[PDB]
Ligand binder design. Sequence first.
Ligand SMILES: CC(C)(COP(=O)(O)OP(=O)(O)OC[C@H]1O[C@@H](n2cnc3c(N)ncnc32)[C@H](O)[C@@H]1OP(=O)(O)O)[C@@H](O)C(=O)NCCC(=O)NCCS
Ligand SMILES: CC(C)(COP(=O)(O)OP(=O)(O)OC[C@H]1O[C@@H](n2cnc3c(N)ncnc32)[C@H](O)[C@@H]1OP(=O)(O)O)[C@@H](O)C(=O)NCCC(=O)NCCS
Lengths: 247, 422
Amino acid sequence: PGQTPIRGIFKSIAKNMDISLEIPTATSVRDMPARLMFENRAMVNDQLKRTRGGKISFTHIIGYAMVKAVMAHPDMNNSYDVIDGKPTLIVPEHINLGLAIDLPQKDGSRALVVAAIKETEKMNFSEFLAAYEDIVARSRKGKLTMDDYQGVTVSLTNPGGIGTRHSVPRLTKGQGTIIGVGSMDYPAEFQGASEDRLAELGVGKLVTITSTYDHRVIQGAVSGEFLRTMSRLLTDDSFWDEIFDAM
Amino acid sequence: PGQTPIRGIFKSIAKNMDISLEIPTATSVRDMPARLMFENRAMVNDQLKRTRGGKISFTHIIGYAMVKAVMAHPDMNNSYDVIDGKPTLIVPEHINLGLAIDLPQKDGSRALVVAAIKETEKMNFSEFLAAYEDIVARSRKGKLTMDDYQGVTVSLTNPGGIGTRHSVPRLTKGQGTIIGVGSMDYPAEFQGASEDRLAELGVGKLVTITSTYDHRVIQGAVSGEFLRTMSRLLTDDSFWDEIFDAMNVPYTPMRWAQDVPNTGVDKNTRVMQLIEAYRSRGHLIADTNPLSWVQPGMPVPDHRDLDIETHNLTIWDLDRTFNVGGFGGKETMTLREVLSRLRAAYTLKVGSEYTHILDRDERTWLQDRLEAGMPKPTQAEQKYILQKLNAAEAFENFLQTKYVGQKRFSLEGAEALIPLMD
Ligand SMILES: CC(C)(COP(=O)(O)OP(=O)(O)OC[C@H]1O[C@@H](n2cnc3c(N)ncnc32)[C@H](O)[C@@H]1OP(=O)(O)O)[C@@H](O)C(=O)NCCC(=O)NCCS
Ligand SMILES: CC(C)(COP(=O)(O)OP(=O)(O)OC[C@H]1O[C@@H](n2cnc3c(N)ncnc32)[C@H](O)[C@@H]1OP(=O)(O)O)[C@@H](O)C(=O)NCCC(=O)NCCS
């Protein structure tokens, strides 16, 4: 009980949240079927098990789809800044994808950090998976440099691990959008039903995906079309041929 | 039409909303089943009605769960301030819970106020309910002081009364979080379906709960875990045992389980076995003791035969219809009505043992008279019972007063013997 100064990484988190108050933000929400993801992921993980490889996750698949979608809709990669006291649009050279990793510390307090995969628009699924696992591995061992925290152009977060349905997050300065992935589960009005009955009816599972963007440089129609493209890719023949071929 | 200055309470509401612009906020949303809440609330309100008590609401239950959750995740109680021009985290001493009460005024304009229940982390459900009703009562009569509006650490709101699905509200300065409760109803894609069809499928009702927090002092993972804890408590065995114990209800609470298929032994067979179990062994849980006393060294018999889990039935069968073979003078009935009748006949103030009798005509005579119930007596009859009770007690007290030391072997404690013999 009482008052205590904020020190360390927490002071940095506090200062950035205060700066971010000067961004006008809006949000879009879309829900998608998730059956084909469960099926095709299982097929890939069976192959890896026989070949004594690793394991892929839902975030890997959604990550790759997200990159393809940003290529199809380039406006989602832009940001805003005032330079020489004039308003300015900033168009980057590459797509650098930030991952929000929750890592506990030595003290016993959790902190969230955003690390970057760089030059993602010239990768196939095999390359993408390697880069992803590299960042995650080094984060646990505590061997991330200062260069890994710089140059992010678009971010990804996964609150659905805990079981949240969806969220409305904060956008940090220097970016245009942040994408969030919610729980992949049956709706709550079917959580007491029998397996037999669900199979008979043909009820599937959901996923809700969100988009939070800066409204000075991105319009609503662009954000909507972005999510529509992601929805088409995750249920598309040609998309899953790529992943299967690479693995 | 035209312009008019804002004056009074409205000017205060306007100023606070302007100040609140300097809080960075984020939101989390989660949806939960709501069947067990409907069931167990009904059981508690039936007990209170017989004892001429009050009524509990959904906000009472969610409120209590919310307090338990804040205890499990203390970070949700903290706030932010700048002191001596340095950033600072503030950790309070108590959990003070603010309620958002919509109260109309004399003029005819509605206004929202937030009043506080203080020192909530040292309360049981009985204490909690009293404090809640105290605040609400005084608000309507217009007798809230200035101390009731100060010291709030966490807030609760209920937009689901009107029928809103969920909301994204504003957070006021000095707090860390605000929790919102949405509509408890079927989804809108089932609002035209029949009751029969919904019962067949096994479709339940929802509730959506939100959390809006200050991101300088609370992280997303903490907010998510908070809502996960609340979800577990509202479907937990041990949680509902507390509430039932505190409100003095004698039955086991309805439990949470999955719906089971109608395979193997049919469900009509299982409902007939339940009827037989209550007729045979229901006296083991009847309200026949005036004291709340269990003798320490005596064995307690097994009475697992009297709960619907042992006969492979579930909350999902309560509104389905079954063949009962003349029970209650009906050929068909719901499991809710079956349980109601059995409990009224074999579990109140009279417990009966008669199923061991070998003759069929004897058994039927008793069974018929015991399930019809006790007929309502007239006023003259009621006054006669009161005269006899008075005579008994008065006689004992007279002898006590006039002859103190003398041995008399009193009947005090058992005065109902006189009207029984009569
Ligand atoms: C091991 C690794 C390859 C991922 O393995 P994983 O088991 O698929 O991922 P997690 O351990 O985080 O998830 C555990 C479980 O939660 C499930 N899960 C995760 N996110 C989910 C979501 N949004 N909805 C539903 N289930 C989810 C996973 O499917 C897994 O269940 P399973 O028993 O069927 O495999 C590795 O990348 C890892 O551990 N990553 C964690 C950190 C991270 O990815 N952070 C960045 C996220 S943006
Ligand atoms: C009388 C009292 C004990 C509550 O009684 P109550 O009937 O349970 O509550 P209300 O009168 O607000 O609700 C009326 C009806 O709406 C229903 N309802 C309320 N909130 C609901 C919600 N979120 N979703 C669905 N139904 C809801 C109640 O169940 C009740 O229906 P019923 O006919 O089945 O009883 C008393 O506390 C009261 O009147 N409170 C109102 C003010 C208040 O609680 N304000 C603070 C809320 S944070």
